[model samples]
Target chain A: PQLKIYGLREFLDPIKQELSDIINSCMTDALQYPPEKRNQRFFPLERSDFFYPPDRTERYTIIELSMFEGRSVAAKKQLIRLLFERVQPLGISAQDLEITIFETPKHNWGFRGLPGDE
Target chain B: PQLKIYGLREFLDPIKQELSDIINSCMTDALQYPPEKRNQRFFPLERSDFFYPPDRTERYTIIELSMFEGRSVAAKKQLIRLLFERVQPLGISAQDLEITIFETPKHNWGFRGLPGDEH
Candidate 1:
């Protein structure tokens, strides 16, 4: 529920778990989501459905996040800044990645069951 | 510039393209986007990152949609209704799949290069 990641299907298998841990830590480090809470959803796409800027390469990945109102703006940037350090070995260059955080009312997000029921 | 679908990495490969087509058509059918305009993002995740209710099987898939306010409510539900009809062969039962629609102000959705510059 926190973020959904999109990357090339052929390339994500080896590093998926690695990136998952990296993301989990980032959330804990910056967002204070607690040690147990973790969020990662992958959309492993073919070359066709996945598109990016002309200069970006295949390591390009998209990280779309779920961010409601009233969060720390500085913390958000910190998450991005910290990402490069971890993603370096994964080969996801900063420019190659496209990141967007979306906002929705609390009522709209019911992860396991009916929306607004939570 | 639309929706993103997520599923278990192991089960997704075989039917990804098929689901992509279904999504593309649904966008045009319900949302009225141009036929040429297409959008799909897949996150083929490991079992660890993936989580669901115990009652649900591995066939469970999550579809998080991008829907700005003002779309017809009927059209949206139509898309979900149609999904079960189409995903039958893929083995995604109606109860197993989870769907959420995220809406950002148009300004926040910079899909192509910059946000709000286009559609």
Candidate 2:
């Protein structure tokens, strides 16, 4: 799985490790992801580029997870629940965080030098 | 559709607009996406975090597109071909670029305070 995290530079840059560890923890606990296989990317955008709903603040962050299509809905829900609870220490509220998971056929993923299906 | 673009900062930051425009053009021509619905995110990583195959250069890039499932394989192939042809001007060789498409069910997406399936 891969994580694409988006947030304001001021908020995200300082907490990259804390937040990433928090996220990876949830993935490990819920999805059984290997701790060393972390493939996370961060995008700290300027205010002009990072837009959000009126009710949200500059702290509004988005986490997009791309992975193979197989996790149960219960597991995904648990991951989301865990993320919201864990990231609270970093000052991210459940309301300010939005997560969307994209599931793809294993064959669609190309890594190292071959398709993931192989 | 949303595009997650990744590359080394030195090679990507300078050509963001050009590269983004080239990508959007392919999306428009191949997938019939609206020009206004441009949802692209750039991740310019340091060399330490951005690793690639030995055969590729520092210019090696990754483009991940997430969208609703349904586009024909032919359309996707065309988009890949067009990207290879279009990005040459920006100095991204075909060998240095990798593109992946991820398809998800609509209901899994949430936006505007509602699930995408609602709209």
lDDT of each residue in A1-118, candidate 1, tens digit only:
4677788877776678888788777777877777455556666778898776779887788888775556778988887777766787788877866778766654444344334224
**What is the C-alpha DockQ of each candidate?**
0.15, 0.18
Instruction: Supply the DockQ value of model 1.
Output: 0.15
Pick out the ten consecutive residues of candidate 1 chain B with the lowest summed lDDT.
B48-57
TM-score, cand. 1: 0.57
What local lDDT does model 1 show for residue A85?
Answer: 65
Cα lDDT listed for each candidate: 0.70, 0.82
Give the Å error, residue A3, model 2.
Answer: 6.8
Candidate 1 per-residue lDDT, tens place, B1-119, comes to: 46777778788878899988887777787678886888778877678657444566777787778756666556666665566566777787766666666655767666658777366
Model 2 clash pairs are: none
